[PDB]
Design a protein around this ligand. Structure first.
Ligand SMILES: CCCCCCCCCCCCCCCCCC(=O)OC[C@H](COP(=O)([O-])OCC(O)COP(=O)([O-])OC[C@@H](COC(=O)CCCCCCCCCCCCCCCCC)OC(=O)CCCCCCCCCCCCCCCCC)OC(=O)CCCCCCCCCCCCCCCCC
Ligand SMILES: CCCCCCCCCCCCCCCCCC(=O)OC[C@H](COP(=O)([O-])OCC(O)COP(=O)([O-])OC[C@@H](COC(=O)CCCCCCCCCCCCCCCCC)OC(=O)CCCCCCCCCCCCCCCCC)OC(=O)CCCCCCCCCCCCCCCCC
Ligand SMILES: CCCCCCCCCCCCCCCCCC(=O)OC[C@H](COP(=O)([O-])OC[C@H](O)COP(=O)([O-])OC[C@H](COC(=O)CCCCCCCCCCCCCCCCC)OC(=O)CCCCCCCCCCCCCCCCC)OC(=O)CCCCCCCCCCCCCCCCC
Ligand SMILES: CCCCCCCCCCCCCCCCCC(=O)OC[C@H](COP(=O)([O-])OCC[N+](C)(C)C)OC(=O)CCCCCCCCCCCCCCCCC
Ligand SMILES: CCCCCCCCCCCCCCCCCC(=O)OC[C@H](COP(=O)([O-])OCC[N+](C)(C)C)OC(=O)CCCCCCCCCCCCCCCCC
Ligand SMILES: CCCCCCCCCCCCCCCCCC(=O)OC[C@H](COP(=O)([O-])OCC[N+](C)(C)C)OC(=O)CCCCCCCCCCCCCCCCC
Ligand SMILES: CCCCCCCCCCCCCCCCCC(=O)OC[C@H](COP(=O)(O)OCCN)OC(=O)CCCCCCCCCCCCCCCCC
Ligand SMILES: CCCCCCCCCCCCCCCCCC(=O)OC[C@H](COP(=O)(O)OCCN)OC(=O)CCCCCCCCCCCCCCCCC
Ligand SMILES: CCCCCCCCCCCCCCCCCC(=O)OC[C@H](COP(=O)(O)OCCN)OC(=O)CCCCCCCCCCCCCCCCC
Lengths: 120, 459, 331, 63, 50, 100, 65, 171, 31
């Protein structure tokens, strides 16, 4: 859909306009969930190699957590960028096509007739 | 809702870091603390629901289901710790993890503000239940049972998903609070007819509707005791909750779409109750009685009056407590004679008198003895269905005859008559067993003192 | 006022006190039957004071003391109707029950479960006075199903006997067939009159009262063992003799008759309901007195006797004489 | 059965007798609120719309 | 602590309770702005609820 | 013959090794503390304090308020000669009907 | 006893054959009463709805439903 | 106590005791025994508890909801206005429910109080009951379990179209 | 309990009728 939008400047994971956007906080709950997924990967890595699950290889568990948080931070940056691009294109298209988006006359319910259906 | 979701999740490190002799005690203790905490959901208002966030809310429909759900977990742990005593320790912790995970999915099934998140938690409940039945059920047929439970649900629920996404494309939202104000009337057409079926048939399977009920006397029978407790007490009520939410969007087409299903329920409660008169398996009898009781909840939701919704939510809470207690009583006899045949162990009041008193009280609540909330829900549904059509009292009243007849027959066969001579392993009732019966029966009887908290959002 | 209502509620709370004593126990009782019999003799004495001051002035009241539940326009309260029917039936029932329990201290002396027997007999008496003192249909239905359940538990007192269990379940079956009509009446009064209270039923006074009175007649046919729903009362002789003496002769089985006496402002304006009650009562009193002419079990003869007397009570309701029917109950 | 019933009554009464004694002392010595008209300019707290002290405490503490 | 495992579910309550209160400040756009409950602020008051 | 299988283990009686068993565990100290946890946190905490909590709910779903408010409105419109309730929920001056 | 309880439940469908007898009994006792109670309740509610919309059904004190 | 206008009672006329016999009735002796043995200790305990209440007096309030705009002057699908209109409608519906309950309590109290001449002497309470039940039925009946202010407004507009058509055809 | 003591299909040959009569602990002439 938006593939011609990111085709004049291809293969940019985060373009330069993405820096206009606020980055995800480090206490982002999505980023905390990705760190939790890294911790679960570290536990499964101890489990399949028959290491003691919570205790063995704390350096390896911490590199799992760190690597998932590291990749996931940039994935969340790109996610928020693409939804911001989606809304920017939507609003610029509505602003440039007023004949397709008229302001509908809102009626109050004193004029609005709705059919009544009795439950009896 | 996150003050309940996070302690329920903290039960997972609590069960996996506990000492091996402490995993029942610790999970029972802290699940009882979560259940005590669940009464803060009774901050309900006469006009507004208790709306926590964009994701979660709780009106007077979801609140008793939440309190019953959070109450059922310690009782399931007490019911299950004896027959899993010889189990491997990690499999025991995995069993407790499946119960905790099922509680976690249920409490945000009932509080899900948005309907597709309701759908995802609603269907997420399948996986721990399927695992509990097929892994810790006792017999061969559990595997076949796990298929029926899986595939009557999904075949009903995958058209719901599409239907909900269609509403997402039509209304722009699936927030139930937005849909309270943006609901448009659903006229008579074929498109809206299959819209109605896609919105309703997943919950018809969950209730179960008569004719769609066949998964239940396999799934509740072949399950272990905690599986049967949560299946009868909570997971049937996902269908009633989902109907009470989804029939907002289905007016006025419901006024003639309900006619076949009402027939299937009104005759179905005559059939399945009659089936209970000739059941040889006691646990199958309790399962068919659950189908018969949920038929009234189906009729009450489809006729959609205030009295019928009040009776249906009272009957859902009351049936949850009563059916869970009846499965626990049948399990207490199964853990002595190792057979679910009801005619096998007879005359048990001569051997086990206090457990016979628990059988008596659970039978009296099953036959809706006033003033139990069983009778409150039963009676209010009967009032509303009499107003719907005066002839229904026939099929209502005849049901209350047969409901009495199978309730006492169960009580006469197992408790009365002469004891079986060759059965000599009838141990005296453990403190755990009488405790389990009292933790079902005492809240059930105390709710008769103040039933307004289980009468739902339009009390 | 303050004497009448206080001693009214003291009679009922006093009856509930030995149930609380037997449920909160640790020891083997020093003659719990004597305690229950002393309690019921004292409740007879306490119930005689509102009866005397009804005989003096005609003093009647309603004690709606506890708001229980409001279903939008149906306020349900714990409500006690102290009128002529309660004022005469409560002392007669307490006097009869006091004799039944001093009889039971002899007759049931060999029974190892005599405390459970006196507990069940007192629970019957409590549910029967809930039935006869009720002001709304829900509380009357509590008393109604309560005397049905205590009837079950007391017919099947010797529960290893197959005939006792069969007779107890038969009594349940016929009474639930009558409860169909009870719940029909409750449904009609709620939908058409917006009430279960007797006062609004009598004040609205509906002319199209065929269907609720047919429901009440079906409920009395079940409860008072009229023809068609009669054989459970001769089957109920399978219980012990104090059960047959208290419940199945004098106190429980008049309840259906009592129900139609309670709704006499509706039956007096319905000649069709009067004719139905007249024909049903005459059919019952002929058939059961005819059955009693050849029986050999003495309790079966007395059971067909009292079902014939209940048929006579149904007759005198059917000739629009409800106070003679109530007098024949108390007699 | 007797041991179960003794332990059941013990653990119900263990908190129930202090709860009944405390409710009695609250009803006697603290006592119940009196209905009053709202003064001019006074904005009541949300727990001040309830009559019993335990209800006001629940409304102030939890709800 | 010798009984450190008995604080997992209670602190998970409190922290959960904390997050609920922390969410309320994110849903305070209509605080003292509803037509039903808008009012002038009392002295030494900055918000009508927290 | 058929394969190598453990025979059926006989069903254990918890009262044999522990005649004071509450049925929670075969270790008697764990059994007694499981009993105390179930009874204290189930009956002493949830049932008693929970029933006390429900008994003193602050006007659950504004029923009592609604009586008292009704006792205001009746008293306003008994005295002013107004009817106790109108058939119209909404003022007919603020309703446009579809003309015909 | 085990043989009886197995015959009553699990052996029934392996020994079911759809023929004239089982089809004519399964449709008489399975969908027959559904059609019957459908037409009874439908005729009753059509008659009652017609009486209410024609102002003939006495609904004077009916406010609970 | 309560307000004697919303819960009215006629003045009590009890007759003076005119004993014709020489036998003393037990009711006067039991009334004196109830006054001595029962009523005075209960009164003293209540006076003690009432002094303990008067030592610490505090107040609660009846919550006053101001009137927000109703559903007729809310724009269609405007959830912020029609939410408040819906909450106002639900509160008014709950209060109308309690008004019907008050009038039913008056009707039942009159039926017990007037006794055997209840049919003549309770015509005013019966008439008020009939008026308020007709108003409640026109306002809220047949809306269903999913009632709202929109359903009630649609019911009122249907009833007003029927009344306008009946007025037009009769002129 | 085992598989050849459970109920099975309808007996057609006389030896099948004989072995199912033996299974239900009764005579072939009575089965
Ligand atoms: C966490 C979840 C993932 C855990 C994976 C590893 C699990 C494991 O091995 O546990 C063993 C280990 C104990 O084992 P052990 O004694 O050390 O050694 C192994 C045994 O010998 C084991 O004995 P055994 O192997 O000889 O025989 C027993 C047998 C028993 O097995 C059997 O007999 C066969 C199976 C039985 C039936 C099946 C039951 C169901 C299992 C699947 C779950 C399905 C439901 C999940 C959701 C529904 C959808 C499918 O196998 C096991 O028990 C093997 C261990 C695995 C058990 C648990 C499996 C969990 C992994 C899969 C679920 C989680 C990931 C997917 C989730 C899906 C969506 C939610 O358990 C733990 O330690 C649990 C964790 C406790 C501490 C948690 C602390 C959390 C702290 C969080 C904060 C810190 C991080 C912060 C991050 C953010 C920074 C910003
Ligand atoms: C007692 C121990 C019981 C056992 C302990 C353990 C119990 C088990 C565990 C329970 C745990 C709690 C469970 C949750 C419940 C929480 C409490 C609650 O919700 O209370 C609700 C409710 C409201 O309490 P509240 O909101 O706190 O107070 C409202 C007031 O506005 C505010 O109150 P107030 O300020 O207006 O009143 C203050 C009141 C304090 O308030 C209380 O005590 C009420 C709280 C007690 C609640 C107890 C509930 C537990 C269950 C009790 C029932 C079962 C007991 C065993 C069985 C008995 C037989 C059945 O003061 C008094 O009590 C003192 C007055 C004493 C009068 C009698 C003596 C006078 C003469 C004395 C002469 C000698 C001295 C002369 C000189 C004196 C000089 C100074 O309280 C009650 O219902 C109290 C129970 C009694 C009710 C009336 C009983 C008679 C009714 C008869 C007719 C109706 C029934 C007909 C049946 C017919 C047969 C079928
Ligand atoms: C908030 C505060 C509330 C305080 C008040 C409590 C309110 C009710 C709560 C629930 C009470 C049930 C507890 C007893 C039954 C279960 C255990 C048992 O069987 O023990 C036998 C045992 C004594 O027997 P045993 O000789 O040692 O051995 C038994 C034998 O093996 C052989 O046994 P058996 O067959 O000879 O004897 C069993 C017998 C068998 O008798 C029957 O089955 C006949 C019952 C039905 C016909 C008669 C009643 C009909 C309805 C009228 C009553 C309700 C309305 C009354 C109002 C006026 C009208 C509107 O049952 C009884 O006598 C129980 C009396 C109460 C029956 C309640 C209705 C059950 C019927 C089914 C449902 C009906 C609708 C629900 C009603 C709910 C009312 C609140 O009892 C005890 O040791 C009691 C332990 C302590 C109980 C505490 C109860 C409260 C627990 C709640 C805790 C939290 C709040 C704190 C309150 C604490 C208060 C102290
Ligand atoms: C548990 C077993 C039974 C389960 C039953 C589940 C429900 C049964 C009915 C499902 C119908 C299919 C989904 C409908 C979703 C409705 C969404 C919608 O907008 O509909 C209107 C739309 C209308 O199209 P539209 O909305 O795009 O058009 C615009 C609107 N108009 C019409 C005005 C121009 O309906 C459809 O497009 C088709 C609806 C019928 C679909 C028929 C194919 C499926 C048949 C039923 C299969 C059921 C499961 C089979 C498997 C059984 C077990 C193995
Ligand atoms: C031995 C123990 C007794 C108490 C000992 C200690 C106290 C000593 C003596 C002093 C008395 C205590 C103070 C007065 C009592 C409290 C008074 C009071 O206002 O209480 C508040 C209220 C009075 O009612 P209310 O109308 O004020 O409030 C009810 C609450 N709303 C409005 C929300 C509905 O509650 C009670 O009094 C509760 C006790 C009721 C007693 C009867 C119980 C029957 C249970 C049956 C269950 C099923 C019923 C189904 C059928 C119903 C009918 C259809
Ligand atoms: C709830 C949904 C999920 C279901 C499962 C939940 C399980 C989890 C458990 C959580 C805790 C328990 C929750 C439910 C609590 C219900 C109890 C409760 O709150 O009650 C409040 C009720 C409410 O009554 P109330 O409304 O009148 O209270 C008045 C309100 N105040 C107190 C503020 C003035 O409390 C009472 O009734 C207290 C009065 C005394 C108790 C009754 C005494 C008499 C009982 C019968 C005596 C014998 C009569 C004759 C019979 C003879 C023998 C048969
Ligand atoms: C794993 C993450 C590794 C990321 C490394 C850097 C990759 C990169 O810069 O990719 C650029 C690409 C956007 O380039 P674009 O031209 O828009 O792609 C059109 C393709 N349909 O960016 C992307 O495609 C990023 C998303 C890739 C995610 C793949 C795994 C999920
Ligand atoms: C077995 C297990 C137990 C059962 C589980 C549940 C299964 C049943 C689920 C569906 C129930 C039946 C379908 C719903 C009936 C609702 C009313 C209806 O459709 O009436 C029949 C219809 C009447 O025609 P009419 O009302 O004019 O419809 C045109 C609408 N514009 O009549 C017709 O138009 C004629 C029939 C046309 C074909 C309809 C096929 C689709 C519906 C069934 C699937
Ligand atoms: C019709 C009919 O006679 O079907 C008989 C046919 C088998 O014919 P057969 O007797 O074997 O030669 O059998 C068949 O054709 C199979 C069954 C026919 C369809 C039956 C549909 C209704 C069954 C009951 C549904 C209840 C719900």
């Amino acid at each position: 859909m938006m593939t011609g939008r990111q085709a004049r400047a291809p293969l940019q994971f985060l373009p330069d306009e993405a820096r206009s956007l606020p980055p995800p906080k480090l206490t982002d709950p999505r980023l905390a969930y990705i760190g939790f997924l890294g911790y679960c990967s570290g536990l499964i890595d101890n489990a399949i190699r028959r290491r003691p699950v919570l205790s063995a290889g704390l350096h390896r568990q911490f590199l799992y957590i760190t690597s998932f948080v590291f990749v996931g931070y940039y994935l969340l940056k790109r996610q928020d960028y693409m939804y911001a691009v989606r809304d920017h294109d939507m609003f610029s298209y509505i602003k440039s096509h007023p004949e397709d988006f008229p302001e509908k006359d809102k009626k109050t319910y004193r004029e609005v007739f709705e059919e009544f259906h009795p439950v009896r | 809702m996150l003050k309940y979701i996070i302690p329920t999740m903290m039960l997972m490190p609590l069960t996996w870091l506990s000492k091996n002799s402490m995993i029942w005690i610790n999970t029972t203790l802290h699940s009882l603390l979560i259940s005590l905490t669940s009464l803060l959901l009774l901050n309900q208002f006469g006009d507004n629901s208790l709306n926590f966030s964009l994701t979660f809310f709780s009106d007077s429909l979801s609140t008793p289901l939440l309190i019953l759900t959070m109450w059922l977990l310690p009782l399931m742990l007490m019911a299950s710790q004896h027959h899993l005593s010889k189990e491997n320790l990690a499999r025991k912790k995995l069993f407790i993890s499946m119960l905790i995970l099922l509680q976690l999915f249920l409490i945000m099934t009932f509080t899900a503000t948005e309907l597709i998140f309701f759908y995802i938690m609603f269907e997420a409940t399948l996986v721990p239940t399927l695992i509990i039945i097929t892994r810790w059920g006792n017999q061969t047929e559990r595997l076949n049972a796990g298929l029926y439970f899986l595939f009557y649900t999904l075949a009903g629920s995958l058209p719901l998903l599409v239907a909900l996404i269609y509403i997402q494309n039509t209304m722009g939202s699936l927030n139930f609070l937005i849909l309270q104000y943006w609901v448009q009337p659903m006229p008579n057409s074929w498109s809206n007819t299959f819209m109605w079926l896609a919105c309703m048939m997943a919950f018809m399977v969950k209730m179960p509707l008569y004719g769609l009920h066949l998964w239940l006397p396999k799934a509740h029978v072949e399950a272990p005791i905690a599986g049967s407790m949560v299946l009868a007490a909570i997971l049937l009520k996902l269908g009633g909750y989902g109907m009470m939410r989804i029939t907002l969007l289905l007016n006025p087409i419901t006024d003639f779409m309900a006619y076949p299903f009402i027939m299937l329920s009104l005759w179905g409660m005559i059939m399945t109750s009659s089936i209970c008169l000739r059941q040889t398996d006691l646990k199958s009898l309790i399962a068919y009685s659950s189908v018969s009781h949920m038929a009234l909840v189906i009729v009450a939701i489809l006729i959609q009056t205030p009295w019928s919704y009040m009776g249906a939510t009272a009957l859902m809470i009351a049936h949850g407590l009563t059916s869970s207690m009846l499965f626990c009583l049948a399990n207490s006899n199964y853990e002595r004679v190792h057979s679910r045949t009801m005619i096998l162990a007879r005359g048990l009041q001569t051997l086990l008198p206090l457990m016979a008193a628990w059988w008596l009280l659970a039978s009296l609540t099953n036959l809706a003895l006033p003033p139990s909330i069983n009778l409150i829900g039963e009676l209010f549904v009967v009032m509303s269905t009499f107003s719907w059509s005066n002839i229904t009292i026939i099929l209502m009243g005849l049901n209350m005859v047969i409901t009495a007849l199978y309730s006492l027959y169960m009580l006469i066969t197992t408790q009365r008559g002469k004891h079986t001579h060759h059965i000599n392993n009838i141990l005296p009732s453990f403190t755990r067993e009488n405790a389990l019966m009292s933790l079902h029966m005492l809240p059930l009887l105390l709710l008769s003192l103040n039933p307004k908290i289980i009468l739902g959002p339009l009390y | 006022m303050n004497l009448f209502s206080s001693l009214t509620l003291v009679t009922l709370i006093l009856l509930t006190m030995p149930i609380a004593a037997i449920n909160f126990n640790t020891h083997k009782f020093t003659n719990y039957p004597l305690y229950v019999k002393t309690t019921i003799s004292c409740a007879f004495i306490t119930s005689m004071i509102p009866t005397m001051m009804f005989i003096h002035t005609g003093q009647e009241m309603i004690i709606s003391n506890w708001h229980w539940l409001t279903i939008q326009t149906l306020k349900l309260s714990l409500s006690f109707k102290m009128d002529f029917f309660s004022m005469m039936f409560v002392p007669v029932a307490l006097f009869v029950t006091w004799s039944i329990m001093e009889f039971s201290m002899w007759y049931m002396h060999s029974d190892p479960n005599i405390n459970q027997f006196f507990k069940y007999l007192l629970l019957f008496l409590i549910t029967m006075l809930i039935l006869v003192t009720a002001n709304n249909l829900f509380q009357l239905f509590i008393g109604w199903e309560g005397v049905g359940i205590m009837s079950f538990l007391l017919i099947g007192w010797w529960y290893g006997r197959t005939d006792a269990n069969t007779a107890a379940l038969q009594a349940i079956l016929y009474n639930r067939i009558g409860d169909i009509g009870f719940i029909l009446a409750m449904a009609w009064f709620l939908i058409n009159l917006n009430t279960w209270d007797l006062q609004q039923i009598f004040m609205l006074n509906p002319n199209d009262s065929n269907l609720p009175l047919m429901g009440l007649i079906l409920a009395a046919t079940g409860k008072s063992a009229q023809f068609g729903l009669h054989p459970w009362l001769p089957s109920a002789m399978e219980g012990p003799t104090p059960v047959s003496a208290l419940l199945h002769s004098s106190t429980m089985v008049v309840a259906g008759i009592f129900l139609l006496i309670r709704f006499y402002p509706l039956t007096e304006n319905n000649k069709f309901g009067q004719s139905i009650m007249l024909c049903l009562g005459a059919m019952t009193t002929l058939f059961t007195a005819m059955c009693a002419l050849t029986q050999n079990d003495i309790k079966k003869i007395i059971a067909f006797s009292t079902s014939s007397q209940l048929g006579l009570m149904m007759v005198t309701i059917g000739i629009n004489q409800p106070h003679l029917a109530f007098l024949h109950i108390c007699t | 059965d007797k041991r179960f019933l003794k332990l059941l009554r013990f653990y119900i009464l263990l908190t129930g007798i202090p709860v009944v004694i405390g409710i009695t002392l609250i009803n006697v010595f603290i006592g119940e609120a009196e209905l009053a008209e709202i003064p001019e300019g006074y904005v009541p707290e949300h727990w001040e719309y309830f009559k019993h002290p335990i209800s006001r405490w629940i409304a102030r503490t939890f709800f | 602590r010798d009984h450190w495992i008995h604080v997992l579910v209670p602190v998970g309550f409190v922290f959960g309770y904390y997050l609920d209160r922390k969410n309320d400040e994110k849903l305070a756009a209509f605080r003292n702005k509803s037509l039903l409950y808008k009012r002038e602020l009392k002295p030494q008051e900055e918000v009508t609820w927290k | 013959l058929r394969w190598q299988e453990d025979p059926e283990p006989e069903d254990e009686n918890l009262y044999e090794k522990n005649p004071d068993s509450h049925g929670y565990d075969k270790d008697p100290a764990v059994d007694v503390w499981n009993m105390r946890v179930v009874f204290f946190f189930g009956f002493s905490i949830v049932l008693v304090l929970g029933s006390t909590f429900v008994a003193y709910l602050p006007d659950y779903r504004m029923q009592e308020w609604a009586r008292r408010e009704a006792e205001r409105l009746v008293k306003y419109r008994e005295a002013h000669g107004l009817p106790l309730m109108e058939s119209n929920c909404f003022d007919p001056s603020k309703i446009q009907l579809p003309e015909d | 006893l085990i043989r009886w309880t197995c015959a009553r439940s699990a052996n029934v469908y392996p020994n079911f054959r759809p023929n004239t007898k089982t089809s004519l009994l399964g449709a008489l006792f399975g969908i027959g009463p559904l059609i019957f109670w459908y037409y009874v309740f439908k005729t009753d509610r059509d008659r009652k709805e017609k009486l209410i919309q024609e102002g003939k059904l006495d609904r004077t004190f009916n406010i609970s439903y | 106590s309560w307000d004697k206008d919303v819960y009215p009672e006629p003045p009590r006329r009890t007759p003076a005791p005119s004993p014709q016999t020489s036998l003393p009735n037990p009711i006067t002796y039991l009334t004196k025994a109830f006054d001595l043995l029962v009523d005075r200790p209960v009164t003293l305990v209540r006076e003690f508890i009432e002094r303990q209440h008067a030592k610490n007096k505090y107040y609660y309030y009846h919550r006053e909801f101001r009137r927000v705009p109703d559903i007729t002057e809310c724009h269609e699908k405007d959830v912020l206005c029609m939410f408040e209109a819906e909450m106002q409608w639900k509160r008014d519906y709950k209060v109308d429910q309690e008004i019907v309950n008050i009038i039913q309590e008056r009707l039942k109290a009159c039926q017990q109080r007037e006794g055997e001449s209840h049919r003549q002497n309770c015509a005013k309470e019966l008439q008020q009951f009939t008026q308020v039940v007709k108003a409640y039925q026109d306002r809220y009946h047949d809306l269903g379990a999913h009632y709202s202010a929109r359903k009630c407004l649609a019911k009122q507009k249907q009833r007003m179209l029927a009344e306008r058509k009946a007025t037009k055809e009769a002129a | 309990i085992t598989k050849d003591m459970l109920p099975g299909p309808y007996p057609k040959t006389p030896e099948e009728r004989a072995a199912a009569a033996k299974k239900y602990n009764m005579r072939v002439e009575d089965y």
